[PDB]
Amino acid sequence: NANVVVRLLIRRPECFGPALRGEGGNGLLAAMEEAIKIAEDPSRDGPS
Amino acid sequence: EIQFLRTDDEVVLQCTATIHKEQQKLCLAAEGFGNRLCFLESTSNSKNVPPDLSICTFVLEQSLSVRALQEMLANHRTLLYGHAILLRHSYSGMYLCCLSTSRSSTDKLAFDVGLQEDTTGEACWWTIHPASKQRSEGEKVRVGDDLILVSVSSERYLHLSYGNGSLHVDAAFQQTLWSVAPISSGSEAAQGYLIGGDVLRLLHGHMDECLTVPSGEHGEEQRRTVHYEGGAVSVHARSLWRLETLRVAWSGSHIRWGQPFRLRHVTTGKYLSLMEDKNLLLMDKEKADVKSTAFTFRSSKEKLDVGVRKEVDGMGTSEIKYGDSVCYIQHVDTGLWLTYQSVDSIQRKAIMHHEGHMDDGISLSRSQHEESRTARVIWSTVFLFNRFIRGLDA
């Protein structure tokens, strides 16, 4: 059940999120820093 | 009734491009010595720029099932969908593979695609998956069909990188359909008969003068000229010529009388052509148009034509015989016959005359594989070492 899941995930790279899509994705490390900055920012964290 | 692609058949892998509103046709190419990476050769601009199919021709060596291939890794048949194929480059003799080392260009997971000497390992093998809904896993392989190839080693589709400024073949999970077109069939070929893409010498007269360019005095402008010469040039590399058909598909078919083609000087890499001054001059690949570079073989000196033939998909009739047959070259558009100037080693010039002399017959002699390979290596090496010298001079 693991090999099939990995094969499907790599077949559809959109499942990895914008950071890991591979189309100019910044990367996991930059993505989580961006998410932290969003966390401090009230406008993007909440619906407002 | 309908042909099926089988092993030991020489094929060219073709892909289509729709860049900038325009439908372009491309083929997979890779030089043997030097760069092992693979580039794309344009085939849609065949009229304006001649394609170089010698490095694009591939041979289908074995087709094995996935389980049989796995057992082999643990340790003349027709292609069937769902099998593993071993692609061998015709010129180099090496095998197509995934390199697993990438340029890291715009794709996180990409693996570059190149040529590999060793057949061991699963990197060389590729699995053929039919893409069309009509085609089902286990169907007979169609002559005209679109295939998606999956790497055995990396499970990455062979695709064209559309986003990159320069189009590149790469192995990734994004899929692109590839169309295979037969170039020739080795078994059905007849010995002693001219075929497309065969390196040969043009011999004239009993003195056996060979149509060649001047020697290695390093002057490109006068190397561009052509003349009849005899002596050791017949066993020298300058007398080597290759015949490329104007058609792409089934380009290895038996050449017939009145069939237009192109002549390329293997050592120089340039193509024979006729200028407006009614003089022969080798021209560059970029400016080598179909009109100027068109030449044909006609059985008899008589000017009356037999009309036109209908092009057939297959080897065809063995209508041209090596040595025994006597041929006369005529430019397709102008209709003129190139003849020796005769105004006087011998160094007799080649001129374009619609009357010509009585003895304008040209015999055909087949070059050896080793000599053809050596001439191609010489051209590909002199090009690189001229680029290096120019860079150092700058």
Q: Does A7 touch chain B (CB under 8 A)?
A: yes
In angstroms, the Cα distances linking B36 to B97, B160, B179, B324, B333 are 10, 17, 23, 40, 39
Look at strands B178-185 and B199-204 and give their pairing.
unpaired
Q: Is the CB of residue B320 less than 8 Å from the CB of residue B196? A: no
Method by which this entry was solved: cryo-EM
How many CB atoms sit inside 10 A of residue B35's CB? 13
Q: Is the CB of residue B306 less than 8 Å from the CB of residue B258? A: yes
CA distance B350 to B338: 7
Q: Which residues pair with B167 in a beta bridge?
A: none
Please give the DSSP secondary-structure letter assigned to residue B193.
B
Q: What chain B residue is nearest to A19 in terms of C-alpha separation? A: B108
Burial class (CB in 10 A: 0-12, 13-18, 19+), B1: exposed
CA distance B218 to chain A (A): 48
How many CB atoms sit inside 10 A of residue A18's CB? 12
CA distance B288 to B211: 20
Burial B111-123 (b: 16+ CB within 10 A, else e): bbbbbbeeeeebb
Please give the DSSP secondary-structure letter assigned to residue B300.
S
Element (H, E) at B89: strand B84-89
Which residue in B310, B307, B262 sits closest to B285, CA to CA?
B262
B109–A13: do the CB atoms touch at under 8 Å? yes
A13–B106: do the CB atoms touch at under 8 Å? no
Backbone angles phi, psi at B354, to 5 degrees: -80, -15
Please give the DSSP secondary-structure letter assigned to residue B310.
P
CA distance B201 to A3: 58
DSSP reduced 3-state for B270: coil
Angle, alpha carbons B178-B176-B154 (nearest 5°): 100
Residue B265 Rama label (left phi>0; alpha psi -120 to 50; beta): beta
Burial class (CB in 10 A: 0-12, 13-18, 19+), B108: middle
B108–A20: do the CB atoms touch at under 8 Å? yes
Q: What chain B residue is nearest to A12 in terms of C-alpha separation? A: B173
Quoted resolution (Å): 3.3
CA distance B63 to chain A (A): 24
DSSP string, B312-357: -SS------BTTTS-BEEEETTT--EEEE-------EEEEEESS--
Q: Does A31 touch chain B (CB under 8 A)?
A: no
CA distance A24 to A20: 9
Tokens standing for B36? 């092992």
Residues 6+ apart with CB under 8 A from B230: B207, B208, B209, B210, B345, B346
CA distance B215 to B385: 19
Single-letter amino acid code for the residue at B294: A
In angstroms, the Cα distances linking B213 to B26, B94, B220, B380, B385 are 32, 32, 10, 18, 21
Q: Does B155 touch chain A (CB under 8 A)?
A: yes
Single-letter amino acid code for the residue at B292: S
Strands (E), B186-313: 199-204, 209-212, 227-229, 241-245, 261-265, 295-298
CA distance B140 to B333: 43
Q: What chain A residue is nearest to B175 in terms of C-alpha separation? A: A11
Q: Which residues pair with B245 in a beta bridge?
A: B261
Question: A–B: how many Cβ contacts below 8 A?
Answer: 15
Please provide the distance, in angstroms rounded to a whole number, between the alpha carbons at the two ends of chain B. Answer: 61
A10–B106: do the CB atoms touch at under 8 Å? no
Q: What chain A residue is nearest to B108 in terms of C-alpha separation? A: A22
Using a CB-CB distance cutoff of 8 angstroms, which residues of chain A are in contact with residue B173? 10-11, 13
Q: Does A27 touch chain B (CB under 8 A)?
A: no
